[PDB]
Design a protein around this ligand. Structure first.
Ligand SMILES: Cc1cn([C@H]2C[C@H](O)[C@@H](COP(=O)(O)OP(=O)(O)O)O2)c(=O)[nH]c1=O
Ligand SMILES: *[C@@H]1O[C@H](CO)[C@@H](O)[C@H](O)[C@H]1O[C@H]1C[C@](C)(N)[C@H](O)[C@H](C)O1
Lengths: 7, 384, 382
């Protein structure tokens, strides 16, 4: 991954 | 002053930003926001100038098969999209506060750099502190971050003046990210001393309780709150069902929570009151205890209220903080047993526990957004 | 929680309903609609599932010489049609919200009665609540209605196992209709303290204006809006000509809405512009003032847009704007170029432009949410 979230 | 508050993510980590913003305004400061499209309604019902950016977070508010902003296949679009629409919004600004999606964070930090203004990144719990991670873990973050959107970042930094950066995780989170969580519920660890904790950022709730509920509350013995969130997950419904039972088993009335998507309830003995978009701030102060899921938002509201609480832990952070403080009980497992929830309730309803929950509440802060504001003001006053 | 929203009426009686439906679906609840054929494209556009029922309301939408759904003639067909198409839509709902044509509203309330789910009827102007009606004329309404469709109603009512009802006016509107209008603009009168005023139901529009409309707005001075929405009486085309003149006499450009009247600009002049469907919320945020008809919807969209307005009298909102001191009323249907120029002069005065943008923030924007939570509480209690 590498971007985060939280969706 | 004028402050830009950006962020890309769910309602849990976005609502705090809307709260800081609304507060900065109450203090006479032109605070504007940069959020995903699905938050316009919200910024409307609170009155905060907000300029949309990127794909929408909420799947529903999104086109047919349109990937979400966290999708790997659109990091680059994310970087570009932000780096593009942010300049207009960060026009006359002396400070920037961000949270959420790293790609968009790195993008925003750059406009802050170009424009020479101060930038602050905030996290909602100590777990998410860079300082609470291993030196190696931090290396995976930066590596993966760089390997994922690094090129796209440096291409737009170049395409506008700024020099190439490396370690996008350290770059976006900052050496010392702000922690907008309450010090009593989310205390710092001995490894985070150099960190600034403002307090939780919660939006004040003025809404009164409906006449029916007021009627219910008044009409008898103080009820117990049971609420497990908006999770439609089958287990969540079973836990709720099991809690209604533990509460009845204790000869107590109930104020139960239900989502907009749930099926109507067959019937309710006059001892159960279903409640929807209610003001939890005002309601918690009207009940004997709260049985709920492992959620910081509900946990804090309950703690501020000073009511004992029963927390069903996930698969367990807050659940246990409640017991550490000796203010509630962490029953566990997806679906606890009637016996399990019944023994917890018996403890929760104990006078000594209620006294402890009361003592604790006397120690909880309600000025995070103001403390945050005072920090921002001083920032501009020494860096701009 | 499925909610069925229905009605038969002009675009102003529908747009607010489409807003509650869109909001409900945004909140997690579900919504379905039963509306006249005219709004299928509009609903598809907002993404709200809708079942087309009955004749089209807009005159130019039906065959020539064809009667409208309000015409006493068709009444029995209307009643019959709704009792026939609503079940497929209402099956599985937990409540229902209506507005518009009484004969259709009663058919719906009956089918809701059979299912055991709460029903609510809404009005868009306080002066339409049965409590601002002399309990004399109220009797005329019931008598009138009971005689017009009454029998047909109880007929179908019978076909599904229902006991007959009388006083169809109090049934359609119920003993406590809702007022989906904003407090600052449409305040309740002390003769109706009880009623529930939720605040206007507005649907945050995100549609962009066309490229040409943008080009216009850019290539020149800021224009005055002229439009009469669903108005389709003959005078309308004349009233539009008098307003265009008044604005041109002032030396300002204009944006004209075709509306249900299919108005055409008087000439190929380049200082004007005709639009069809359009994001009024957006456009209103880009004009100097608006000259329009007396209507709940447009008066509020302009009022929350912070612009001065000129309202053309019939021969409620006209005055409401006057008193709030944000615009001017002028007699009609076809106003004189003088009055309009006098108004366009008062209205664009530094005094009004001020109060206009002041009264804009006193406007509630949580209208559909309040109604939503009221429906949630209903479904539980009842
Ligand atoms: C003409 C037009 C109207 N509207 C909507 C916004 C208004 O709230 C709604 C109803 O207007 P309203 O004037 O209340 O009713 P009527 O025109 O039937 O007398 O119509 C648009 O969104 N776009 C348009 O192009
Ligand atoms: C997300 O990354 C930050 C980066 O610095 C870490 O500090 C944090 O611990 C990490 O969050 C955890 C816990 C969480 C939020 N529940 C998720 O499971 C993520 C994937 O991991």
């Amino acid at each position: 991954x590498x971007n985060x979230x939280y969706x | 002053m004028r402050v830009l508050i950006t962020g890309c993510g769910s309602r849990g980590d976005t609502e705090p930003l809307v709260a800081l913003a609304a507060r900065l305004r109450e203090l006479g400061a032109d605070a504007r926001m940069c959020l995903p499209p699905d938050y316009v309604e919200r910024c409307a019902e609170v009155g905060v100038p907000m300029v949309p950016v990127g794909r929408a977070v909420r799947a529903g508010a999104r086109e047919p098969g349109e990937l979400p902003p966290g999708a790997a296949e659109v990091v680059t679009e994310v970087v570009a999209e932000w780096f593009d629409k942010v300049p207009a919004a960060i026009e006359g600004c002396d400070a920037v506060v961000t949270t959420g999606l790293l790609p968009a964070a790195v993008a925003v930090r750059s406009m802050a750099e170009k424009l020479g203004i101060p930038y602050r990144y905030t996290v909602l719990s100590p777990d998410h502190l860079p300082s609470e991670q291993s030196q190696a873990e931090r290396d995976m973050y930066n590596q993966g971050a760089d390997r994922l959107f690094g090129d796209a970042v440096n291409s737009h930094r170049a395409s506008i003046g700024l020099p190439p950066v490396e370690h996008l995780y350290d770059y976006g989170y900052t050496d010392q990210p702000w922690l907008a969580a309450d010090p009593v519920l989310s205390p710092l660890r001995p490894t985070d001393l150099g960190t600034v904790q403002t307090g939780a950022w919660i939006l004040p709730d003025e809404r009164p309780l409906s006449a029916e509920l007021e009627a219910f509350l008044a009409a008898g013995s103080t009820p117990v709150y049971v609420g497990f969130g908006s999770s439609s997950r089958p287990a969540t419904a079973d836990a709720a069902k099991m809690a209604i039972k533990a509460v009845r088993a204790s000869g107590r009335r109930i104020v139960l929570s239900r989502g907009w998507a749930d099926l109507v309830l067959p019937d309710d003995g006059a001892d159960c009151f279903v409640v929807g978009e209610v003001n939890l701030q005002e309601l918690f102060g009207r009940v004997a205890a709260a049985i709920h899921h492992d959620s910081a938002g509900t946990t804090l509201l309950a703690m501020r209220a000073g009511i004992p609480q029963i927390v069903v832990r996930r698969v367990a952070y807050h659940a246990d903080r409640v017991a550490e403080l000796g203010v509630g009980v962490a029953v566990d497992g997806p679906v606890p047993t009637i016996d399990s929830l019944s023994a917890a309730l018996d403890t929760a309803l104990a006078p000594e526990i209620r006294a402890r929950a009361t003592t604790v509440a006397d120690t909880i802060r309600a000025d995070g957004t103001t403390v945050a504001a005072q920090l921002l003001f001083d920032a501009v006053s020494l860096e701009k």
